Design a protein around this ligand. Structure first.
Ligand SMILES: Cc1ncccc1N[C@@H](C)c1ccc2c(c1)OCCCO2
Length: 116
């Protein structure tokens, strides 16, 4: 509270670490469904059903232009990619399985990088 400061983790490396994690995501074999925005003009239903589209290139642009206040807002956007994927894709489809795979991949890197 006022004049009662909580000790805080060193956040000075977060930008570099999130960029590294995103690079590993981008280069993953199963990243192809997520590298660019879904084309709202070519993919029926997507614009109406998915209220907040997100993809790796958009995340990369936001990371590069200071649009994430902290590492938690970065993780929200990454998870939003896979949440959208689950909404629109059957689990037993190529894109659906890709999403599950990339989510697992992300969360381990996230834990290993930032949880002690
Ligand atoms: C992640 C996601 N969720 C719902 C719909 C599409 C997508 N991914 C988009 C990028 C995509 C993937 C596969 C596609 C495609 C486009 O069209 C062009 C070629 C055919 O195959």
């Amino acid at each position: 509270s006022m004049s009662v400061k909580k000790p805080k983790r060193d956040d000075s490396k977060d930008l570099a670490l999130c960029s590294m994690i995103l690079t590993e995501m981008e280069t993953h074999e199963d990243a192809w469904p997520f590298l660019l925005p879904v084309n709202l003009k070519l993919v029926p239903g997507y614009k109406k059903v998915i209220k907040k589209p997100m993809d790796f290139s958009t995340i990369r642009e936001k990371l590069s232009s200071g649009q994430y206040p902290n590492l938690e807002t970065f993780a929200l956007d990454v998870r939003l990619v896979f949440d959208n994927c689950e909404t629109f894709n059957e689990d037993d489809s190529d894109i659906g399985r890709a999403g599950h795979n990339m989510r697992k991949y992300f969360e381990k890197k996230w834990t290993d990088t930032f949880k002690v």
